[PDB]
Amino acid sequence: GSHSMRYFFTSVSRPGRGEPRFIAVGYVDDTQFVRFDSDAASQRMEPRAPWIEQEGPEYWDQETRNVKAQSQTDRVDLGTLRGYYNQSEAGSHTIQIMYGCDVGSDGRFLRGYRQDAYDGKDYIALNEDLRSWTAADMAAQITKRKWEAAHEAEQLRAYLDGTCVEWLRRYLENGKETLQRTDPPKTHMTHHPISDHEATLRCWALGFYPAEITLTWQRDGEDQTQDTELVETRPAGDGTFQKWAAVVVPSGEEQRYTCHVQHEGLPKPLTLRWELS
């Protein structure tokens, strides 16, 4: 199957309460393997998966230096973007950045990406070709002109389709005993009366990895898009994920409903039905 390496960065200004909070997290697929937190004690990049701890001191020195350099640029950009958006020095604001790359099961490069946000909304993104940028508004276009003139895309591309791929391949080999697993979902249905005449049917998926999954409710084959309650996929805390989807049905009509489960780890899509006697 395919794999990804992604780094997530959040910088939050804290006017009058010190320098901005900076948190960086690195993932391979849905497994976190490094972190940096400006409010933590070490002020180092730190391991968060067993298979990265074998990296040597020169690895952690370089990761610490480069991730702190990202935090410095983000602190500068918080002030720059305050100016572009004509905001006061008093408020707290947020920059978020995600970048990374995908490889196929044979290790070939599939795609690279970088997306930036300001106060929770799109700011600027690298396009699929890794050659051009899309700014979200007229303020972000100022950044785009700067990055065009400085040939930032070419510099970033050499990382996204070069360095990123090389190290993702190394990590997949170093963590192969645990990153190549796909745990398919363990599924079941529950049933909860809400009155004498109605009940909730809840379709469960448990213990699956990766986190990507689809749960869908059909009535007589017709989808129930608007009457379905769907919760966000959530971590179990042991490396797997959980999700459920629910529908309120008339008592006695349970057998007219089916829940359909799709997961890359499932030989065939699962269909679940309440087993009324």
Binding site: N66, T80, Q155
Partner: peptide, 10 residues
């Protein structure tokens, strides 16, 4: 590994 230091500001 993260990208190397030196990218320009916004």
């Amino acid at each position: 590994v993260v990208v190397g230091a030196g990218g320009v500001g916004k």
